[PDB]
Amino acid sequence: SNDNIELVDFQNIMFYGDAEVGDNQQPFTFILDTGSANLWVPSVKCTTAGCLTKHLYDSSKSRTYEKDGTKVEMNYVSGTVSGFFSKDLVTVGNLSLPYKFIEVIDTNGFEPTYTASTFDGILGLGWKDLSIGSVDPIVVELKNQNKIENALFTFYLPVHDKHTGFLTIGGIEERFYEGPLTYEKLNHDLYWQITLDAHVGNIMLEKANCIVDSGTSAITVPTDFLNKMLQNLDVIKVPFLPFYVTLCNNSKLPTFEFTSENGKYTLEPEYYLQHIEDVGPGLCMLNIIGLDFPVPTFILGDPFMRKYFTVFDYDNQSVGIALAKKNL
């Protein structure tokens, strides 16, 4: 019944999945990003160094290509790509639909991220009004065409050296989680954002905005909240970068607890530490960065999602959260 695209871990920090553009089935690797709402692929017309090692899109070889050519720039927090709109058949798992996407010709504003990673493009899994060009989300559009049961998708993330992951479209599969699945209502029209009380030891923020974001390989915390957490924690900031290093077994490292009237979600140090033995013996980096939004906000990124199976439900305007099964 449901369509299941396999997720591959890349250096236990990112994960990617593959999909196709064109009726000649041109293959691409995507970051799958719940926090954005446009699809893009690098073009054969790309003029920049970053495209050299990528799978490139050739509209001339697809009979289902429809020209648009409207110029567009996608601005991410990690950089900018530019190009123009094109329309073609997009295939995700076994499902296809004609889809508007961005043909990228300049990726120099997205370095060094682009050249250092093995993805080709980004496939947005956000809300329509967050898109450029008023593009209906893939999953919404697939439901509207009755190709899937429900306008929802789920993430069961891969775990480095343990199991593969899945982006599942159309339904919720019991095989991905254990214990209860708790639904948290979205608190915003166009982000996968929910309200949770956030506790880290003695520090807490009542009714914080929490964005569940598949494209962010960190937990982000308000900067003042982070500053309090790190006080007398025996961690050291990396020169010039917003990351902190610690002895891996530092017993002061706290557990994040997020609560709603419905549920309680925790994130222990094992889920947010990254070993860096090559930099030194028994050293870890915290996958936590300080970021201020206009309203106090946490991004519950990839470290959160490695622990917790997540359901993104457009029809019920909610995020479902459950403990991910350790193995399939």
Ligand SMILES: CSC[C@H](NC(=O)Cc1ccc(O)cc1)C(=O)N[C@@H](Cc1ccccc1)[C@H](O)C(=O)N1CSC(C)(C)[C@H]1C(=O)N[C@H]1c2ccccc2C[C@H]1O
């Ligand atoms: C609507 S369209 C995209 C939107 N535009 C904007 O907000 C407009 C904007 C542009 C520039 C700016 O100064 C501020 C604003 C954007 O970018 N939303 C992002 C989510 C986001 C949003 C706000 C804060 C943090 C992150 C997006 O969903 C996303 O996940 N991204 C952007 S590409 C990406 C898929 C590689 C990933 C990313 O960067 N990851 C790195 C990251 C990020 C943060 C911490 C550690 C690390 C490590 C890496 O994992």
